Amino acid sequence: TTALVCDNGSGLVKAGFAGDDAPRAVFPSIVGRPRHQGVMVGMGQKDSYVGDEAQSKRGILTLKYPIEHGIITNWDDMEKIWHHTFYNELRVAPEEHPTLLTEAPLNPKANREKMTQIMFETFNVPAMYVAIQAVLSLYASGRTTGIVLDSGDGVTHNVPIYEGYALPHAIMRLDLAGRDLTDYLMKILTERGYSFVTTAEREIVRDIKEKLCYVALDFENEMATAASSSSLEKSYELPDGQVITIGNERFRCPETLFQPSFIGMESAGIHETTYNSIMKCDIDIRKDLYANNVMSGGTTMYPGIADRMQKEITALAPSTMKIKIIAPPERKYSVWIGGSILASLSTFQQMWITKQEYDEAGPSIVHRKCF
Amino acid sequence: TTALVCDNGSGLVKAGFAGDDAPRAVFPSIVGRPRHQGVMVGMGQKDSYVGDEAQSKRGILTLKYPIEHGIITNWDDMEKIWHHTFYNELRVAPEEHPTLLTEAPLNPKANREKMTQIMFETFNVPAMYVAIQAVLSLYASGRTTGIVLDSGDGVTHNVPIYEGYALPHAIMRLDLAGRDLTDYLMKILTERGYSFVTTAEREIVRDIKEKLCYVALDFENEMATAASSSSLEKSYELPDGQVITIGNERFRCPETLFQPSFIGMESAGIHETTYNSIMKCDIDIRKDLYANNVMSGGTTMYPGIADRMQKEITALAPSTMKIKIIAPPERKYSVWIGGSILASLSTFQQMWITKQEYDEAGPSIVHRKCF
Amino acid sequence: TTALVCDNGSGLVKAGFAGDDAPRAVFPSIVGRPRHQGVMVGMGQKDSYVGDEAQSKRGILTLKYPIEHGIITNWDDMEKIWHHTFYNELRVAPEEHPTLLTEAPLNPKANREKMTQIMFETFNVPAMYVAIQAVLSLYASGRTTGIVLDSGDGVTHNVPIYEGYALPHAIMRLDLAGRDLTDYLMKILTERGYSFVTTAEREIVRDIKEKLCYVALDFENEMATAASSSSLEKSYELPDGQVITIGNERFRCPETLFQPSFIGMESAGIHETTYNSIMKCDIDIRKDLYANNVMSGGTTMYPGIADRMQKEITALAPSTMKIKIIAPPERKYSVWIGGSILASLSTFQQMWITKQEYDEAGPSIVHRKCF
Amino acid sequence: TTALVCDNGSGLVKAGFAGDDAPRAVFPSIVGRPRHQGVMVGMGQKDSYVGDEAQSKRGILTLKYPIEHGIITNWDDMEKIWHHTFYNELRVAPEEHPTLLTEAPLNPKANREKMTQIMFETFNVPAMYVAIQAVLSLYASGRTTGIVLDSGDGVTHNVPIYEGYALPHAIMRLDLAGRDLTDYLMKILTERGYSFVTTAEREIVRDIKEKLCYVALDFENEMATAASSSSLEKSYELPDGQVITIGNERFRCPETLFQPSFIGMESAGIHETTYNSIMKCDIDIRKDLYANNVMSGGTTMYPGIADRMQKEITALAPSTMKIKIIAPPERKYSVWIGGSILASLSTFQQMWITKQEYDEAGPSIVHRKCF
Amino acid sequence: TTALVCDNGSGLVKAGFAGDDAPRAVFPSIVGRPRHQGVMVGMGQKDSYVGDEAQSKRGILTLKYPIEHGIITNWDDMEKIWHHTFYNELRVAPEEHPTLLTEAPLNPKANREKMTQIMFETFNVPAMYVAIQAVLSLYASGRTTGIVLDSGDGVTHNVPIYEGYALPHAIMRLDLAGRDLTDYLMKILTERGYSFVTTAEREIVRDIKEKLCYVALDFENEMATAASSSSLEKSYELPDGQVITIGNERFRCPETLFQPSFIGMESAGIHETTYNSIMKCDIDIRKDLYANNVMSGGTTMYPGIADRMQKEITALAPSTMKIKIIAPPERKYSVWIGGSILASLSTFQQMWITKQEYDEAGPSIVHRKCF
Ligand SMILES: Nc1ncnc2c1ncn2[C@@H]1O[C@H](COP(=O)(O)OP(=O)(O)O)[C@@H](O)[C@H]1O
Ligand SMILES: Nc1ncnc2c1ncn2[C@@H]1O[C@H](COP(=O)(O)OP(=O)(O)O)[C@@H](O)[C@H]1O
Ligand SMILES: Nc1ncnc2c1ncn2[C@@H]1O[C@H](COP(=O)(O)OP(=O)(O)O)[C@@H](O)[C@H]1O
Ligand SMILES: Nc1ncnc2c1ncn2[C@@H]1O[C@H](COP(=O)(O)OP(=O)(O)O)[C@@H](O)[C@H]1O
Ligand SMILES: Nc1ncnc2c1ncn2[C@@H]1O[C@H](COP(=O)(O)OP(=O)(O)O)[C@@H](O)[C@H]1O
Ligand SMILES: [Mg+2]
Ligand SMILES: [Mg+2]
Ligand SMILES: [Mg+2]
Ligand SMILES: [Mg+2]
Ligand SMILES: [Mg+2]
C-alpha cells in the first residue's frame, strides 16, 4: 500500500515512502555521458551514468541536468532518472504504489502533462498526483498560514497561504536560485585565479559553496571589514589536493539573493519579493503573514539567512508588525516531508488520479484543483 | 494664443494644441534608466531616457511608469516627462500657452495640488485648469447625456452625466485596467513556456495584447471551441525573431474585465459596474443612460467589446430598454479630443486658473467647481 | 604629449603612439635563454634574448612566453619585455608619456595590480590606464553596438556591447586560442612523420599554420573530398630546406575552434559561445547583435572564418534575423587601433590614473569603472 | 585457434601465443650484414643474420635496427625479422593464427598501414589487430586506472587511462629512451679511455648498462660522494677479457631520464612529463592517477627508479596526495603480457580485422577505435 | 708578457708566441732511439733524438710518436718533446709565459690532468689553459658560426658552433686520419713491389703522400680512366735515388676519408659524418651550418678535397640549401692561428688557470667551462 513521494526537483531527486520522516534516496538529478573517447560498447562500456555514479566518475563525464529552471527540458534523460530512481535507488517496482509528484508553480502545462503520460505509460503507476511544493512545505512546518519562501537550485518562489486557503494571485517566481549562485561563484572565483570551466568543476564549486558560503547581516559593513585579512578567509581542499583560499566571495555569492543585479537579474531581491507578495494580499491577512514566514529548503540553508531577512523585512514592514521567520532544521527536505505527511493523510486519498481516469479524460485532468 | 491640451494619462501622454482634432505628441509615459553598468557620464552617457527613446533602447533600461493606478507617485520623473513633453516633443515654450490638464475622478487631492504647483513654478504656465476626463469624453462624442466608461491602463471608471449635469454620487472606479490586463497576460503566457519577466518584456507583452487580443461574445462557448485547434490560434513574432503561438489567452486576457476574479480582483465586472452606476441614478434618467453608453479609450479598443457589453447589459436591463453602446473610431483619444474642443470653446475661457489667482489663494483653488 | 598604446597580448606585443593608425613595434612576446651550454659571460655572451632577436637565434634558445592564457605568469620576463619594448623597440623614454594598457576580461585581479605596480615603480609612467580589449575593438570598427569576438593566441572571449553600454553579465571566455591551435597542429603533423618537439619547432609550426591553414565552410564535406588527392594538399619549405606536404590538417587544425573536443576541450564551439552570449542578452537587443558581430584579431585571420560562422550562426538563429559578421582587413590589430583612437579621444583624458592617485589610494584603484 | 601476440618493439621482439604468461621468442630486432669482405655466396655464405645469430656473430656484422624511435624505417629488414620470428623462432605457420600487434601512440599512420599490408599479403594472416601498448600494460597490471609510463629503447610515453576510458588528450611522447641512454653512455665511457665506436661495441655497452647502471635517489649527493673511491666503482669484463672500471657513469647514464639536457634533449624529465600529463587531466581524476602510476618495461628496469620517481613526483604533487608507483617484477614484458590477456579475452574477439574486411575497406580500416 | 701557444698535435708540434700569425717552431712529434747497436754512451753518444734531428738521422732510429689517436700514451717521451720545444726550439724559458694548450674533444680526462700536472710541476708554467681545437679553428677563420671539420694525423672530428655557442651534443670523432692514410698507402704501395716496413720508410711514405696524393671528384670515374696509362701516373724520387711510379694510389689513398671501409673502418665517410652532425642540430640552425663548413688543417690539405665534399654534401642536402665550404690557404695551421688570436684577446685573460688555483683546487679544475 503506502505511496511513493518523489520530489523531483531540479537539483536533487528526493524519493521515499509515505510515512517516513526522511527521504530514502537523495541524489543529484544528473545524467552524465563520456565526455570524450566516443565509446563503442566493445566489451561492455556503458555510456550513461546517473546520480551518485555520475558524481563518482564525474571526471570523465559531461554532466547534464535534465531540468532547468524547474522545467523538464531533456525528457529522455528525465525518464532515465526516474527509471534509475525506482529500480536502482529505491529498489521498488513502480506499479506497487501510487506516486506523489511535486513541482514549482507557474510551470508550462506541458510539463505536467508529459510527466503524467510517462508515469502512466512507462512506469504504469496505478494512480498519480502532482502537488505544489509550497503547500507541502507548510505541511512539514505544521502550519496552515504563512509565506512559503522556496528557493533551491532552479526555482525561487513565494506562495501565500492563509488558514488552508491558497492565494494564487500573489505568487512570485524568480529564476534566481542555487544554480545561478553556483555559476556566479564560478565567475567570481576567477578573480583569484581559480579557473573553473568544466561541468565537473562547476559541481566542485557547488560543493565549495555549500561548505563555506554564508549570508552577511550587513553586506556593506562586512565587505568593508574584509579589507583587513581575517577570519573571513577560509581554505578549501580540492579533489587533487590543491588548496583554495576564499575571501569576499564567501558572502558575496549568497548576497546575490538580496541583490539580483549581481548577475544581471532585473528583479528585486527575495526580501522585496516576499514583502511585495504580502502587499498583494488583503490587509486583514498581512499581519498573520508577517509573523509566519516559512523558509523551504535549498539555498535557505545558508548560515544566517533567516536573520538577514528578518532584518530587511523588519525594515520594510510597519514597526508594530512582529516579523518572524520560521526556518527549521531539516528544512532542506521540507517539501518531501510534507509530501510524506500528505500522502499518509486520510482524506487526501480521494485526490489520486487513477490511470483509469487519465485514460478516460486525457492530459487535461491533471489541472483539476482540490486540497 | 490657443492652449495646450495635455492628457497626462498613466499609459500614454497625449499632448497637442487646442483646435486640432488629433494629438501631436503621443508617447509612453516612461522614464528609463540604465538597468546595469552603473554609468558614470565619462564621455557623455546620459542616465535618463524618456518616451520613444526609452522604447528604442528598452533593452538596456529599467522602465518606470511615474503614474500608477492614475496617481502620480514618482514626482521627479513626472516633472521630467512634462519637461520632455514641452521641449522635446511639442517643441513649444510652456509660458506661451495656458494648459489644460486631465485626471481620473476620486484621486488624492495632493495629486492635483502638487501637479498644480509644478505647472506654476517649474513651467510658469500663465494659467492652468484641470478637468475631469469623463466630461471631456462626452464632448468628443458630441453628447450631453450618457455613461462614460473610461478604461485605460491605470484606471477604469464610470461617470453618469445627464443633459449637462454631472451625477457625482454614482461615480465608480476600478483598479482593473490595461496594466493589469498586461500583467495577467504575462502570467498566462507562462503556461506555454513564454517566460516574460523584465520590464522590457512586459512592454512586449503590451504589444502582443494590442495585436492579438479580443473580446469574446460568449467566453464559455468560445473557450470550449478552443479545445479544437483552429483560427483561435495566431502567431506573433518577437523582437529577436522567435515566434509565439497564442491560443486561449487571446480572449482570456480581456475577459478579466468581465470577470475581475481572474486576477484576484474582488469587484464586479465592468458590465455590472456600469449597470449599478445607472441603478444609483434617478429612475427618470435611467432610460436615457441605457441608450447612451459611451466608451472612452484605452482598453475599449479590444475587438467586439462593444457588442459584448451590449449583450450583457441587455441581459441585466429591462427588456423594453433599448441598450445602445456608443463606441466610435478614434475613441482611444476621446478625452484628448474633448479637451481640444473645450479649450477652444468660447465661454470656457473663464475657467482658467491664473497663476495670479493661485498665488493669491493657494493650492485649494483647484478644487473649485464649474462647467 | 600624445600617449603610448601597449597591447601587451599573450602572443605579440603591439606598441605604438596614440594617433597612429598602425603599431610601430610588433614583435613576439618571447624571452629566450641559451638552451644548452650553460653560458658564463666570459667575453660578453648574454643569456637573454627578447622578441625578434629570439626569433633570429631561435635555434639555440629555449623560448618562453611570460603570458599564458592571458595571464602574466613569469613577471621577471614580463618586466624584461616591457623594458625592451620601450627602449629597444619604440626607442622612447617611458616617463615622457601616459600609457594605455589592455587585457582580457575575467583576469585575476593581481594581474592588473602587479602590472600597475611595475608601470609606476619600474618605468615611472606619469599616468596609466588599463582598458578592456573588447571595447577597444569596437572603437576600431567604428561601432557602438555588437558582439566582440576576440580570439588570439591565449584567449578567446565574447563581449556584448549595446549602444555604448557594456553587458558584462554575458561575457564568455575560452582557453581555446591560437596557441592551442598550434599545439594541436603539432600533434597532428606527427601523423605524417613531421615530428616537431622543440619550442623552436613549435614556433615553426605557428608559421606553417599562418600560411596554409584555413577554415572549411563544411568540414565534413571537405574532409570527405580530401580522400582524393587534390588542391587541398599544399607544400611548405622548412628552414633547413626540407619540404612538407600538408593535407587534411590544413583545415582540421582551425576546425578545433568549432569543435573544441578535438583537443579535449569540454566547452562549446565559438559559434555557440557567441550565440549563447546573445541569448543571455535582453530580447530587445538580440536583433541588433545578430546583425553586428565583430571579429577582432588573432585567429580570426583564417581564410573564410567569417563565412563559416555566418553559416552556423544563421543556422542557430531565427530565420528572420539578418546575420552579419563584420570582419575587416587589419582586424589583427583591432584592439591596438581602438587604443590609438581612445587615447587620442578628448574626453577620455580624465580616465588616466596618475601615479599620484595610485600612491594615495593603492592597487585597488585600477578596478574603478568608467567609459 | 589461440592467437599470436607480437610485441614488435624497437629493441626486442617479443612473440608468443595467447594464453601464455611469458613470451616464447625474445630476441633483438637486429639485422646484420657482413661488415666487410663483400661476400659472394660462392659456397653458401649468407649475407643476412637475424636476432640471436646476429649477436653470436656480431663481430663481423654491421648491425642495423629496422625500427628507430618507434618507427619502422627499413621495411625490407622489418619484413625479414617477421619472417624469422614466425618460422625460425616460434616455428609456426602464420596463417594458423590471427595476430595481435602493438605500437607506440602518435606514430605515423603509414607505419600502421604498411605493416598491415605486409601481414595480409606476405604472411596471409587470417585476421589482425594493432593495439596500443599502454592499454596492454594496464591489463598486465590488472588495473583500469593509472598513468602508464612506457619507456624502452626507442620510445618513452605517457598515457592516462581512467576506469577503462582513455584520455588521449594528455598523451606525452619522448625520443628519450634506452637507445639514447646507451649512446650517451658510450660517449661517457670515453672519459676513461674506453673507446667504443662499432655497432658491435654499442651492443656491448648496452650489456654494460643492463648490468651496472642504476638510478640515484639523489643524483647531486651521490655524485658528490663519488669523489671518494668507493663501492660506486664496479668492474666489468669485456668479451676479450679486458676489464673495465665504471664509476660515475653508473648512475650518470640513467640520470638522463630525469635530466634530458644531458644529451641535448630540450624536453622535461620523465617525472615532469608524468606530472604534467596528470595536470592535463580533469581535477576529479588527478588523485586516482597519483596513487596509480604504472611503470611499463624497458628502462624502468633500472634499480631504484621507482623510488626515485616517487620522491620527485611527491615533491611536485600536493602534500595530501598519496603518491604510489606500481612497478612489478616482470614489467619488462608488461605489454606482451597484456597482449596475451587481451587476445585470450572473450569479448575482444570482435576486434579482429579480417583480411576480408581489409580487402573490402582498404588501409584506413586500421584506424577504427574500440576497446 | 705575451703567451705561448702550443698546438701539441699528434703529428706535428706547432709552437709560437701569441700575436704572431705563424708558428715559430713546427716539427714532428717524434722521439727516436738508436734502433740497433745498444749504444753505451762511451764517448758521448746520446740515445734520444727529438723532432728535426730524428728526421735527419731517421735511418738509425726507431721512431715513436708519443701521441696516438690524439691521446698521449708515452708520457716520458711527451715530457721530453715539451722540454725540447721550449729550450731547443723556441729558445724560451717556460716560466716567462702562460701557456695555451690544445686538444681534441672527447679525450680521456686523465689526458688533460696529467698534462696539466707536468706543466705546473716540470715546467713551472705561471698559468695555463687548455682549449678545444675546433673553437680555435673558427677564430682563425674569423667566424662565429660553422661546422669545424678537423682532420689531421691522429684525429678527425666535427664540432658545430653557432653564433658563439658550442653545440657539444653533436660532436663527432673518428680515428680516421693522416696516420691511417699513411699506413693504408704503405699497404697499397706494396701492390707495385714498393715494400715499406720500417718506421723510417713509413715516414717516407708520409712525404710521398704529401706530394702526390689528391682527392678525386668522382672516384669511380677517375679510377676507371686510370685503366689507360696517363697523367695520373707520377714519379717520386726516394732518398737513395730509386724512382717510384705512383698510379691509382695517388687518389685511392685519400679516398679512404670518404670510404672508411677501405681500411676496415666501420664508420661513415667524412661527408656523412659532417652531414649527420648537422642533422643532430636544431632545424633553425642547419641552414647556417650548410653555408659555413670550415675545414681545419691536416689532411684537408689534399687537392680538391673541398670541391669533393661540396659535391657530396650538396647531394646529401636539400636542393635549396646553399652548400659552401670554407677552406682557406694556411688552414694547416688554423688551430694554432686561432690560439694566437685568443691568447692575445683581451677578455680571454681571465681564463688562465694559475698554478695557484691548481694547487688549491687540484686536477679537476681543468674541466671548468667558459669562453
Ligand atoms: N548547505 C547548503 N548551503 C547552501 N546551499 C545549499 C546547501 N545544501 C544544498 N544547497 C543548495 O540547494 C540546492 C538543491 O536543494 P534542493 O532544495 O533539494 O533543490 P531542488 O528542490 O530544486 O532540487 C543545491 O544544488 C545547492 O545549490
Ligand atoms: N489596440 C488596442 N487594443 C487594446 N488595448 C489597447 C490598444 N491600444 C492601447 N491599448 C491599451 O490602452 C492603454 C493606454 O491607453 P490610454 O487610454 O491612452 O491610457 P491612459 O489614458 O490611461 O494613458 C495601453 O497601455 C494599452 O494597455
Ligand atoms: N594569418 C594568420 N592566420 C591565422 N592565425 C594567425 C595569423 N596571424 C596570426 N595568427 C594567430 O594570432 C596569434 C596572435 O595574434 P594576436 O591577436 O596579436 O594575439 P594576442 O593579441 O593574444 O597577442 C598568433 O600567435 C597566431 O596564432
Ligand atoms: N636490466 C635492465 N636495466 C636497464 N635497462 C634495460 C634492462 N634490460 C633491458 N633494458 C633496456 O630495455 C630495452 C628494451 O626493452 P623493451 O621494453 O623490450 O624495448 P622495446 O619494447 O622498445 O623493444 C633494452 O634495449 C635496454 O635498453
Ligand atoms: N700537403 C699535405 N697534403 C696532405 N696531407 C698533409 C699535407 N701536409 C700535412 N699533411 C698531413 O697532416 C698531418 C699533420 O697535420 P696536422 O694538422 O698538424 O696534424 P696534428 O694537428 O694532428 O698534429 C701530417 O702528418 C700529414 O699526414
Ligand atoms: Mg525543491
Ligand atoms: Mg485616459
Ligand atoms: Mg589580443
Ligand atoms: Mg615496448
Ligand atoms: Mg691538429
Swiss-Prot record, chains A, B, C, D, E:
Oxidation of Met-40 and Met-43 by MICALs (MICAL1, MICAL2 or MICAL3) to form methionine sulfoxide promotes actin filament depolymerization. MICAL1 and MICAL2 produce the (R)-S-oxide form. The (R)-S-oxide form is reverted by MSRB1 and MSRB2, which promotes actin repolymerization. The modification N6-malonyllysine is found at K57. It is found in: Cytoplasm, Cytoskeleton. Gene3D superfamilies: 3.30.420.40, Actin, Chain A, domain 4. The modification Methionine (R)-sulfoxide is found at M40, M43. Belongs to the actin family. Actins are highly conserved proteins that are involved in various types of cell motility and are ubiquitously expressed in all eukaryotic cells. This is Actin, alpha skeletal muscle. It comes from Oryctolagus cuniculus (Rabbit). The lineage of its organism: Eukaryota, Metazoa, Chordata, Craniata, Vertebrata. The gene is ACTA1.
